Amino acid sequence: QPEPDMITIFIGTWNMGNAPPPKKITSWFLSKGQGKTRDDSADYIPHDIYVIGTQEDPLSEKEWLEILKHSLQEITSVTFKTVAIHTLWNIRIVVLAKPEHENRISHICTDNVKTGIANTLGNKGAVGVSFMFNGTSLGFVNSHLTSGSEKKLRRNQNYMNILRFLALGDKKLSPFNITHRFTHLFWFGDLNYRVDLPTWEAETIIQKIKQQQYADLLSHDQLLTERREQKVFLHFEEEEITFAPTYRFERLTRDKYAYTKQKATGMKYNLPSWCDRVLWKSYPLVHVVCQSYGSTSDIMTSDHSPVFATFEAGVTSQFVSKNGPGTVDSQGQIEFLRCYATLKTKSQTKFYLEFHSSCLESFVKSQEGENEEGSEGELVVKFGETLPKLKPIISDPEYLLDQHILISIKSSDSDESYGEGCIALRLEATETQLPIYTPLTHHGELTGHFQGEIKLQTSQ
Ligand SMILES: O=C(Cc1ccc(Cl)cc1)Nc1ncccn1
């Protein structure tokens, strides 16, 4: 039975509004309703992995697991295995996988982050799950960010705290946050970004939604505008939104948006908004294709509609050779020519590089680079031809060309990372000098970039 080179992943996000679900929720797992929906011809085909994020979830873990498993069994006639479940307050993540994947899944991690301080600590934050699927690392984050149209900057802060402090994936990757630890990272939830239009336009917005004319609403969506201005979710992707705003509905119908200020809303307006979202970030040149992104029409117990997204994702096998793992394969090497880092820092410490990859026995520290003054004020750290030669555990190009090198540039004075990035070994040629490039981030903010040339030697 051969190992897969692709899997499908279902991502769900639903703010349940503290109400139990209706008896049937299969439309969610089938990607049926509005938006980019799944073909009917696929309905009996199980996804490999289902990741369910809920917010304002009133159910016990046991109660929700029974509903989810019984739902999937009705659709697929498959009894899914529970990979992980983690709950912070009323924010929950469940990962389910086909039984054939049980002995492909390992290194399961869960964590949570509580956002805010005092007043604003006690119900918002994030839960997450990571694991290895054969040779591929997968991370999943369900966040419930700060509410309210006027609090976009609080949401951006919540985002930075979650990606700094959520402790998932390989702890040996110590310079790297969750935005660099995984081959594929999915981040979803009630992100709570709103359509930033005047209150007086509520009925006009509703009109536009009834016409299925979303363009003038999406151009004011705070998440799209904050992402375009590089304020949040830098280097994440989102599929085009082609479904109606998923908040705020009158319960037990979808015919009415309930936007007016009420004591129950703290006298705040809730103009129709795309609160409920799915984004992802995959390592460079790894296959990832969104095959659905939409909302259900028939699940009406909450003031939010459920959102679904599905993906084709590239995966690799757990490779063994005569040599690695447990030794190097002298027929493999990775060389770096004409390399330099450009950093936004006002500091003047010496800097060195760390190279981290599961194709290495352990991470590799470089010598210090040579600082020059850049012509526009920036710091340029020159490595030239001085970077060490990396010795992969396996030389077979079927393995090595699928790998990635994580780079941290660190202060010699403090050993703190000033920037993190990632280089793909999926090159156009071997034994050939080729340009490489990554942006550098720290705490998920842009801090610089790393560029130079690579020369990769494989067994072929
Ligand atoms: O339970 C797991 C991890 C796992 C892996 C795959 C899946 Cl589909 C579900 C769970 N390991 C384990 N095994 C025996 C005793 C204790 N822990």
Side-chain angles (χ1 to χ4, degrees), residues 2-460:
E3 296 304 313
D5 79 332
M6 221 86 93
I7 57 169
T8 72
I9 305 180
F10 176 97
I11 306 296
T13 183
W14 185 28
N15 179 322
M16 294 173 78
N18 303 115
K23 74 175 162 280
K24 180 175 205 59
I25 59 170
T26 52
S27 64
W28 192 20
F29 306 121
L30 287 175
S31 293
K32 297 303 176 57
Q34 290 179 327
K36 185 183 182 70
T37 62
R38 184 165 184 245
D39 199 86
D40 297 330
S41 72
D43 286 358
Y44 305 143
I45 300 172
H47 296 292
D48 296 287
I49 302 180
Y50 291 76
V51 185
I52 303 87
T54 54
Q55 314 85 33
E56 302 189 34
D57 180 341
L59 298 181
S60 69
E61 287 187 351
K62 174 183 178 166
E63 285 165 339
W64 189 218
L65 277 168
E66 188 186 311
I67 289 159
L68 291 173
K69 290 206 170 186
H70 285 147
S71 288
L72 293 187
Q73 187 154 95
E74 176 159 280
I75 292 161
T76 68
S77 300
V78 171
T79 303
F80 276 77
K81 297 283 187 194
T82 310
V83 175
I85 180 161
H86 189 68
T87 306
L88 167 65
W89 298 317
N90 298 99
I91 308 164
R92 177 178 291 154
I93 184 165
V94 179
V95 180
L96 301 179
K98 298 186 70 193
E100 71 198 61
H101 298 327
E102 185 185 342
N103 303 290
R104 295 179 171 125
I105 290 171
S106 71
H107 296 83
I108 299 157
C109 302
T110 64
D111 197 26
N112 64 262
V113 168
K114 303 166 179 194
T115 55
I117 42 176
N119 273 257
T120 72
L121 196 161
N123 74 289
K124 296 308 192 298
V127 294
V129 177
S130 66
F131 53 91
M132 290 297 297
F133 185 97
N134 284 339
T136 300
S137 59
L138 300 176
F140 300 93
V141 177
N142 171 27
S143 65
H144 188 183
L145 307 185
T146 293
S147 60
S149 65
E150 302 312 296
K151 296 191 171 172
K152 84 184 177 192
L153 299 180
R154 285 293 177 256
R155 292 189 269 284
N156 297 349
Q157 287 167 341
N158 293 159
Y159 166 84
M160 176 179 294
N161 287 319
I162 293 159
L163 76 84
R164 278 185 74 178
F165 297 124
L166 197 67
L168 297 172
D170 179 7
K171 303 315 182 274
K172 296 187 172 174
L173 296 180
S174 61
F176 302 102
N177 62 62
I178 53 165
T179 74
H180 284 120
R181 284 189 177 190
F182 308 107
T183 316
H184 305 282
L185 174 60
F186 296 94
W187 189 319
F188 47 97
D190 182 356
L191 306 193
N192 251 319
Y193 293 92
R194 311 306 177 91
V195 168
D196 220 338
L197 279 171
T199 304
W200 57 264
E201 296 277 58
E203 287 301 325
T204 306
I205 294 165
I206 292 170
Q207 295 210 318
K208 292 295 192 201
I209 300 167
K210 294 182 171 171
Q211 298 170 93
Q212 303 180 59
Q213 289 172 22
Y214 307 132
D216 304 334
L217 303 183
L218 288 165
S219 70
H220 297 270
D221 174 83
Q222 293 168 337
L223 182 49
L224 291 178
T225 64
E226 292 298 277
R227 277 178 15 84
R228 197 178 282 281
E229 290 180 38
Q230 295 181 29
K231 301 303 183 73
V232 80
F233 279 102
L234 182 62
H235 304 139
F236 281 74
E237 308 296 335
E238 190 189 18
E239 179 61 278
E240 184 184 355
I241 291 169
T242 67
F243 48 101
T246 56
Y247 183 70
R248 180 175 180 251
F249 288 103
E250 186 182 303
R251 300 180 190 230
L252 304 185
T253 180
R254 294 294 81 155
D255 289 354
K256 188 184 288 144
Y257 287 99
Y259 65 84
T260 206
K261 69 180 187 176
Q262 299 295 168
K263 293 188 258 173
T265 70
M267 301 305 298
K268 288 175 221 304
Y269 284 94
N270 289 291
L271 292 181
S273 292
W274 287 280
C275 288
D276 308 299
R277 306 290 273 267
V278 179
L279 298 94
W280 74 94
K281 183 182 178 185
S282 300
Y283 284 171
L285 301 179
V286 177
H287 181 85
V288 54
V289 179
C290 178
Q291 296 278 35
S292 70
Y293 189 33
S295 64
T296 62
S297 309
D298 57 346
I299 298 172
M300 292 168 302
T301 51
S302 181
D303 49 9
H304 298 247
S305 283
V307 165
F308 48 83
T310 60
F311 301 84
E312 301 196 327
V315 289
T316 64
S317 298
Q318 295 184 47
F319 213 99
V320 178
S321 80
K322 304 196 196 219
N323 301 301
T327 189
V328 296
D329 187 345
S330 57
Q331 306 155 80
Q333 53 175 46
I334 314 166
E335 296 176 292
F336 294 94
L337 293 89
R338 297 176 56 171
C339 282
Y340 59 92
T342 302
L343 296 180
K344 295 179 186 297
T345 193
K346 291 166 205 184
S347 140
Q348 254 295 1
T349 180
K350 290 187 193 164
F351 291 95
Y352 63 90
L353 300 182
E354 283 181 9
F355 303 88
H356 290 70
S357 184
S358 48
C359 79
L360 304 178
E361 284 202 299
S362 70
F363 76 84
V364 176
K365 270 150 139 63
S366 79
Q367 295 197 305
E368 296 176 318
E370 292 200 342
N371 299 345
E372 314 166 23
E373 179 77 34
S375 89
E376 273 176 291
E378 341 91 277
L379 182 63
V380 169
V381 184
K382 187 170 156 180
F383 291 98
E385 317 298 308
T386 60
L387 295 171
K389 192 184 301 182
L390 304 179
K391 295 308 186 85
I393 58 165
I394 291 164
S395 59
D396 183 337
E398 297 262 32
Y399 169 79
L400 194 47
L401 288 159
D402 279 350
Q403 304 307 308
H404 294 80
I405 313 299
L406 291 175
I407 298 187
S408 166
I409 178 156
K410 291 177 134 181
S411 156
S412 297
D413 290 346
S414 71
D415 292 306
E416 60 189 325
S417 183
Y418 278 58
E420 302 100 54
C422 182
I423 300 300
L425 296 190
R426 188 72 73 75
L427 309 190
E428 287 299 342
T430 62
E431 304 184 311
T432 301
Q433 285 164 35
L434 291 174
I436 57 164
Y437 172 75
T438 182
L440 298 174
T441 64
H442 188 67
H443 301 163
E445 293 192 312
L446 195 69
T447 61
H449 66 265
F450 177 84
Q451 66 199 293
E453 298 177 308
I454 202 165
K455 208 175 112 202
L456 181 69
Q457 198 166 125
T458 73
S459 63
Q460 283 299 110

